[PDB]
Design an enzyme around this catalytic site. Structure first.
Site, PDB file in Angstrom:
ATOM      1  N   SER B  38       6.736   7.138  25.672  1.00  0.00           N
ATOM      2  CA  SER B  38       5.477   6.476  25.971  1.00  0.00           C
ATOM      3  C   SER B  38       5.490   5.759  27.325  1.00  0.00           C
ATOM      4  O   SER B  38       4.415   5.484  27.878  1.00  0.00           O
ATOM      5  CB  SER B  38       5.163   5.493  24.830  1.00  0.00           C
ATOM      6  OG  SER B  38       4.483   4.335  25.252  1.00  0.00           O
ATOM      7  N   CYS B 128       2.187  -3.138   3.705  1.00  0.00           N
ATOM      8  CA  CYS B 128       0.731  -3.040   3.568  1.00  0.00           C
ATOM      9  C   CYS B 128       0.262  -3.380   2.154  1.00  0.00           C
ATOM     10  O   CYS B 128      -0.779  -4.027   1.983  1.00  0.00           O
ATOM     11  CB  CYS B 128       0.237  -1.638   3.935  1.00  0.00           C
ATOM     12  SG  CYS B 128       1.396  -0.369   3.375  1.00  0.00           S
ATOM     13  N   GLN B 155      -2.582   5.352  -2.373  1.00  0.00           N
ATOM     14  CA  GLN B 155      -2.217   4.995  -1.007  1.00  0.00           C
ATOM     15  C   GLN B 155      -2.564   6.117  -0.032  1.00  0.00           C
ATOM     16  O   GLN B 155      -2.364   7.299  -0.327  1.00  0.00           O
ATOM     17  CB  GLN B 155      -0.717   4.661  -0.922  1.00  0.00           C
ATOM     18  CG  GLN B 155      -0.401   3.223  -1.381  1.00  0.00           C
ATOM     19  CD  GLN B 155       1.072   2.854  -1.315  1.00  0.00           C
ATOM     20  OE1 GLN B 155       1.694   2.613  -2.348  1.00  0.00           O
ATOM     21  NE2 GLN B 155       1.633   2.792  -0.104  1.00  0.00           N
ATOM     22  N   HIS B 240      -5.954   1.628   1.377  1.00  0.00           N
ATOM     23  CA  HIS B 240      -5.168   1.658   0.145  1.00  0.00           C
ATOM     24  C   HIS B 240      -5.961   1.044  -0.998  1.00  0.00           C
ATOM     25  O   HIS B 240      -6.708   0.087  -0.802  1.00  0.00           O
ATOM     26  CB  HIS B 240      -3.864   0.872   0.310  1.00  0.00           C
ATOM     27  CG  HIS B 240      -2.874   1.532   1.221  1.00  0.00           C
ATOM     28  ND1 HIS B 240      -2.894   2.887   1.478  1.00  0.00           N
ATOM     29  CD2 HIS B 240      -1.846   1.025   1.942  1.00  0.00           C
ATOM     30  CE1 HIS B 240      -1.910   3.189   2.307  1.00  0.00           C
ATOM     31  NE2 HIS B 240      -1.254   2.079   2.600  1.00  0.00           N
TER      32      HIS B 240
END
Lengths: 335, 335
Positions: B38, B128, B155, B240
């Site tokens: 990157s 999460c 999920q 989710h």
């Protein structure tokens, strides 16, 4: 043996035609019935062609031993008197009679002997999701009594019939084409979504589907078991999935449960974490067993067991269970 | 305030750029870091363009107040020493440090004050699914202590990063075209399926994802609560869903729970059965709240409450929670 199918046009009625042939069910005469919409349609079965008769309040069921009905509770309520008028045994897939105490509510692996007593000559098939759950619960119950169940369901489009399946598939096409998804048979878009409502709500804010898992389970298992369900529609075609926590009167270790599942009628054990082997609806589609895996101890309860299971809604969840009731009665000399 | 984003290329790193702008986070200098893959890429933020630097074991973090890292546990373990070398506070989305007792594990709505003490100048963002659960659990805990939780998760593909999302979308296209579905980033086809495995298995046959919901919840809530989870991958893009049964020390009626949810930070109550209003991932996508509904009493337990909730994995489940930790510390005068 003379056999009727009442409501042959839909997904389950077509499954009856397939199952009754595949399992060499003993048939001397087949009689197809439907509404005026389906009257006059042709179906072939074991090399001969049959013409659907309109279901009328007459004497068409004289001579018929068993009528498998998959025409909805509306039709079953309205025509039960007609179907049973001449001694025909009505095996009803509908929810119409499932809470009538003189109507047995049967899963053959669990309470098959209840089928032998049918004063109204009606036997009811339980709800799909109940059938799959109690087939898994029965081998655990035999080890130690189940007091409580928490179950989260992941229920396929087929619960809304062939039109529900067709809506899901058309949404996949519309989404791939960048079009607006047509929404009709489900209350919201189902593709890329989950709908945590199956059937209408009741006064305790559970849906009718969740309350069937509460009420029918007690009847089938002859049990004070209390089942609390969250039933969710998911973007799957025709196999239902259930995440289940069971609390028993003593602890059952996963290895004891695994041994019981491996010997249980109607169950297929598929539980090898190291091989990524677990039940999945895509692979339980158009298969007979209730597939069981992800068996583990319940970290939240020393008397708890956790597992995951899958079954096909159109087979064991509907037509196969009904045929297996009929096979059970034949096998006990009932005819 | 000088701010670094470590791992800007992926879905969460891009979300940091969006959230930090949308919430007018106070920024005097922005510094982007990534791997060699990157390095040299350009990103615009609030009208100026920034060039990604390769993350090297040097002194690049001198002068940087906060580093938000979404580069995976590999990178966080390897470069935590570099990032914190000059007093920078590392807020880490990775799982690397989540069980280190000298690393606070923070959801601001629940245990924000834990962030104030960071001897290694590392704070970890929880998983999460844990974040979304404890945001819902906190208002119930304040009413009566939660002893046990059963949770079934649904999920989204985003749990497997941008490549998981892209795999799901490509499967939708292949299926609409009648082609074989390419299967790669998930262990099985995900479209028209459910995969009851998220992350690798552990020795008790729970997966790492299920054990995070067990272990992290205790840390965050300062609780002996025992959470048993079944985590299932579903064909949803980035929000989710969780089906939750909570057992408390006294019964909480749905109306008391509803009142608590309606006042709770980070929660949006969406619970009107008569209007078919309930949380759904399609409508919680790219939204901030943990959306809560289907609240009812637990038919299996007089001390039980049942509900359903939804949150966006990329927002509250990742970048938003991390920014809210940073905002909490700013608000307590920490800088």
């Amino acid at each position: 043996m003379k056999i009727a199918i009442v409501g042959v046009s839909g997904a389950v009625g077509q499954e009856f035609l397939r199952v009754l042939s595949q399992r060499d069910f003993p048939i001397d005469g087949l009689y197809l019935f439907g509404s005026s919409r389906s009257a006059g349609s042709v179906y072939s079965f074991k090399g001969k062609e049959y013409v659907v008769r309109e279901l009328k309040d007459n004497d068409d069921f004289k001579g018929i031993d068993i009528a498998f009905c998959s025409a909805g509770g509306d039709t079953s309520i309205a025509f039960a008197d007609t179907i049973t008028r001449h001694g025909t045994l009505m095996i009803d897939n509908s929810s119409a009679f499932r809470m009538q105490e003189d109507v047995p509510l049967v899963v053959p692996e669990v309470n098959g002997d209840d089928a032998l007593v049918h004063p109204r000559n009606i036997i009811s098939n339980p709800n799909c999701t109940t059938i799959q759950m109690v087939v898994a619960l029965k081998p655990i119950e035999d080890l130690s009594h189940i007091r409580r169940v928490h179950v989260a369901t992941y229920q396929a489009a087929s619960g809304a019939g062939a039109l529900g399946m067709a809506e899901l598939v058309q949404q996949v096409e519309e989404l791939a084409r960048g079009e607006k998804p047509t929404v009709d048979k489900f209350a919201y878009q189902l593709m890329y979504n989950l709908i945590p409502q199956i059937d209408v709500f009741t006064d305790n804010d559970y849906t009718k589907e969740e309350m069937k898992m509460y009420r029918e389970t007690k009847r089938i298992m002859h049990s004070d078991v209390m089942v609390s369900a969250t039933c969710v529609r998911v973007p799957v075609m025709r196999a239902h999935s259930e995440a289940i926590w069971v609390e028993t009167e003593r602890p059952i270790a996963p290895e004891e449960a695994r041994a019981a599942f491996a010997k249980a009628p109607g169950v297929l054990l598929c539980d090898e974490p190291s091989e990524k082997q677990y039940p999945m609806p895509l692979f339980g589609t158009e298969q007979d067993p209730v597939i069981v895996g992800r068996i583990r101890q319940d970290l939240a309860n020393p008397n708890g067991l956790v597992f995951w299971c899958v079954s096909d809604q159109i087979r064991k969840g509907a037509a196969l269970n009904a045929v297996q009731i009929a096979e059970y009665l034949i096998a006990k000399g009932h005819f």
